[PDB]
Amino acid sequence: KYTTLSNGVTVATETNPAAKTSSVGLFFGAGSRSEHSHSNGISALTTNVLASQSAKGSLLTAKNDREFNGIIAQTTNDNITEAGKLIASIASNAVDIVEKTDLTKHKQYLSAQASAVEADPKSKVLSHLYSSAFQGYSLALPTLGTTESVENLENQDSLRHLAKHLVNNNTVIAASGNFDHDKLADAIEANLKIAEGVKPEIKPASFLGSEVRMRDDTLPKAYISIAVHGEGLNSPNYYLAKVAAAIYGDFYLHSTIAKFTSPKLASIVQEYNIVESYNHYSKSFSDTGIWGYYAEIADKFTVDDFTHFSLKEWNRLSISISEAEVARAKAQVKTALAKELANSFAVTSDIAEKVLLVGHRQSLREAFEKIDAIKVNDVKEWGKSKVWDRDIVISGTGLIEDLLDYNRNRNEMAMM
Amino acid sequence: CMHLMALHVHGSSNPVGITGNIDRLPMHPYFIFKDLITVFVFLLIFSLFVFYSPNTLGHPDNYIPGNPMVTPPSIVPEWYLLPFYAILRSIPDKLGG
């Protein structure tokens, strides 16, 4: 349900009587993708400063996504309207709050987060993969900025960022839970007061096949990731890309089902225990995406074997995927979509992301209908178009001596 | 084959001399296609010789059937053994040579 208030801001809510808890949040787009190297991380810092305000009993948290930012005030159902007002206040006084703020403490917090994403091997690998894939464009920048750039941010920078991006045309109030939509809309309208402005032009980005290798021989595993130019939220292949990713699905060697998971790659890598774990994903940004896998290999001598087998299984995508695999992938993608949309916090984040970045959100039933329309031939056409023989972007962290340089993995993308 | 085994045990050296272990490349996409450049240059020069002026490296007297009763004016090995032959003549004593 949608209602465009005065100021032109849009309130989008997905109310469900069965919701355990309610959530309402203001999102104003312009994540890291809107920043540049010198002032990178300013969006995350501003959102953290706003989210650090008095919560009046609610749970105020920052979002800090790649392309959009926002503050979400989780709260029980009956309190939702209050939370509404809260965030409205927090955003009608955003410039005042930033001005009166001593950014020191918030900057050590953001630097701690930036170090965290540079220590968690998967976070580091995926951040490096995104940076190298879209190198040269703002989309390459970290969501939370780097430790070198965070410390160089000042209040005036955050004020300029808010003035540019915290405008009615670039902001959305998303909500979910069990409440009357009209009550929340009325409560926010009386309290929301933000500057006018045009929606900032979203910066361009183009995929560039590349390889980045942070080899740290002191780590205990090899955390690699390989991906191709995926499908953005706009592309009609979005769900098709998710189905293609789920065809290969996840795998954890020590999990009980490791010996029974359907995907062929799982059966292949367990013969010599090539890999410890992997997960296929289709990350989707506003207009471009990254479709691939992340993997952790325990045996440093089998990174090449895993890459070879995974890329061969990708080659299967354009030739030999059976109706069983396509049906399994469809069912698993539908279940994953429904799982991702259970928590009211997740529903609010999803509503904000879609409404800001594509303008319209497909209901879950519409998404199910769109996925069920996929046939095996559609998946193979997508594999031919986007996976078969397309440039790949690679990343690795530790014990990657066995990760053969680009040309080997790239040539694996087209050998039968 | 023994040469290649002794090469594989410790690998090949570098123009810089320092250890290559820090940065080593596979061979199939790298140095196999360099091997092809070297092989085709080799075959191109080998064709320039085999088809055009193939007897340049040889000695004309080798086309006169062997006759023990007449020694040719000069005795020289085929070109690639000339250095050692020279050494052989530099030392007067036959055993010394």
Ligand code: HEM
């Ligand atoms: C049919 C004759 C030969 C073959 C097929 C052969 C084979 C090879 C191959 C494949 C390599 C690696 C590529 C290279 O380093 O150039 C190599 C290197 C080498 N060749 Fe040979 N070899 C032959 C004769 C010889 C001879 C007669 C010598 C010395 C008297 C020699 C000394 C070497 C050495 C020392 C290396 C190691 C080079 C390095 O690691 O820097 N080879 N050989």
